[PDB]
Design an enzyme around this catalytic site. Structure first.
Site, short mmCIF file in Angstrom:
data_model
loop_
_atom_site.label_atom_id
_atom_site.label_comp_id
_atom_site.label_asym_id
_atom_site.label_seq_id
_atom_site.Cartn_x
_atom_site.Cartn_y
_atom_site.Cartn_z
N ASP A 276 -21.20 -1.56 1.58
CA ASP A 276 -20.03 -2.05 1.42
C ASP A 276 -19.75 -2.59 -0.09
OD1 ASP A 276 -17.36 -2.61 2.33
OD2 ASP A 276 -18.11 -4.98 2.90
N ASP B 232 -13.85 0.00 -2.86
CA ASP B 232 -14.62 -0.27 -1.69
C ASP B 232 -14.86 0.93 -0.66
OD1 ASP B 232 -15.44 -1.58 0.44
OD2 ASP B 232 -13.71 -2.50 1.47
#
EC number: 3.4.23.46
Lengths: 7, 391
Positions: B38, B234
């Site tokens: 992440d 992201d």
């Protein structure tokens, strides 16, 4: 669906 | 031409809808866990108690190297959240550099809409900066610990590979979903050149978009709107998320370009799938989308271009039929632009922390057809790009 840190 | 980090190549599994994860071990003896990659957060955390969706979890009482920080931590994301207990332990990445480091670990004891049924991951690796770590920036992020305790270069790169068709949990388990090269750039993962954009600020991996095109047509909005409040890269977000005003303009333009066919509003809202007879998806009626990013040279920009093969996310039919189905993976945002997995699947992305920049190159595993390919091109003479940044 993923939606990873707050806003 | 040559790929020099073979041990880390193909060390990821997963898909855009559930995240891409890498195998890691925590504790002594080593406890193996699948950890989602992440770049949108900064905390390293792992399930540490049973949960309906977890097959395994971190057992602190069985690790002789476990250290209790005696402090709680709470992390909420755009979607999902968890509550945990802080500590440190030794950590390794089997298909990663050959080093073990002591890192902060949040042992998740409670959660809501965080773990995903059948995702096969049990933890999260927030690769962004301390500024957004919880409880605060005093909690050193994993990558920082890694770089401080070893000779691993302060850089990592991600090749997220979408299949272009659906995969069930068993297929996800048996297939390669990409690569996370820790400490370098592997040249076998991309084609063409790497173009770099500056990291505007080290908190999220924030960048500045200066222009947006749909099949070459300029969306023509004030560029500040494109980064209205921020634009981040992201790996833990499925969609390309856009600020409300940019989303509405983009959808209008994408609907106008694909108008030879009509789809329900539910499709454009990202809620319902659309299906075509096997092999007949009309890729050519959907437009390519180009995002122009600030370059490293003054008054210079470059663009990255994706195809509907990136923004139309494959999903399994309601009746698991032979139709090829998808959901529209572009959605509105109230917290700025998010270049999620469907954008990253088009490119090899280099998070060059040492030089405060992000590199993009066409991915060797991006899905395309015989008529179009994803692209990274430059340079374009672009002016007053910092005006595009939101303050």
């Amino acid at each position: 669906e993923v939606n990873x840190a707050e806003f | 031409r040559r790929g020099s980090f073979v041990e880390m190549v193909d060390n990821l599994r997963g898909k855009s809808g559930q995240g891409y994860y890498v195998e890691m071990t925590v504790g002594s003896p080593p406890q193996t866990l699948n950890i989602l990659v992440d770049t949108g957060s900064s905390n390293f955390a792992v399930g540490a108690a049973p949960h309906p969706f977890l097959h395994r979890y971190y057992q602190r009482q069985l690790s002789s190297t476990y250290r209790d920080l005696r402090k709680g931590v709470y992390v909420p994301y755009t979607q999902g959240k968890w509550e945990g207990e802080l500590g440190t332990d030794l950590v390794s990445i089997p298909h990663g550099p050959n080093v073990t480091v002591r890192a902060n670990i949040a042992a998740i004891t409670e959660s809501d809409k965080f773990f995903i049924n059948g995702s096969n991951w049990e933890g999260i690796l927030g690769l962004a900066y301390a500024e957004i770590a919880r409880p605060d920036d005093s909690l050193e992020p994993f990558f920082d610990s890694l770089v401080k305790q070893t000779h691993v270069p302060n850089l990592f790169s991600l090749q997220l590979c979408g299949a272009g068709f659906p995969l069930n949990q068993s297929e996800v388990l048996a297939s390669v979903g990409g690569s996370m090269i820790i400490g370098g750039i592997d040249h076998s993962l991309y084609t063409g050149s790497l173009w770099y954009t500056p990291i505007r600020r080290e908190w999220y991996y924030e960048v500045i978009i200066v222009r947006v095109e749909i099949n070459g047509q300029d969306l023509k909005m004030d560029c500040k709107e494109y980064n209205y409040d921020k634009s981040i890269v992201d790996s833990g977000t499925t969609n390309l998320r856009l600020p409300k005003k940019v989303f509405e303009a983009a959808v209008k333009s994408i609907k106008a370009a694909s108008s030879t066919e009509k789809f329900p509003d539910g499709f454009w809202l990202g809620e319902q799938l659309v299906c075509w007879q096997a092999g007949t998806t009309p890729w050519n009626i959907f437009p390519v989308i180009s995002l122009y990013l600030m370059g490293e040279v003054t008054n210079q920009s470059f663009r990255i271009t994706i195809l509907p093969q990136q923004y139309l996310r494959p999903v399994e039919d309601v009746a698991t039929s032979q139709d090829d189905c998808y959901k529209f993976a572009i959605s509105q945002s109230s917290t700025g632009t998010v270049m999620g997995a469907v954008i990253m699947e088009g490119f090899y992305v280099v998070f060059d922390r040492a030089r405060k920049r992000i590199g993009f190159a066409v991915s060797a595993c991006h899905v395309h057809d015989e008529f179009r390919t994803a692209a990274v091109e430059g340079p374009f003479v672009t002016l007053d790009m910092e005006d595009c940044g939101y303050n």
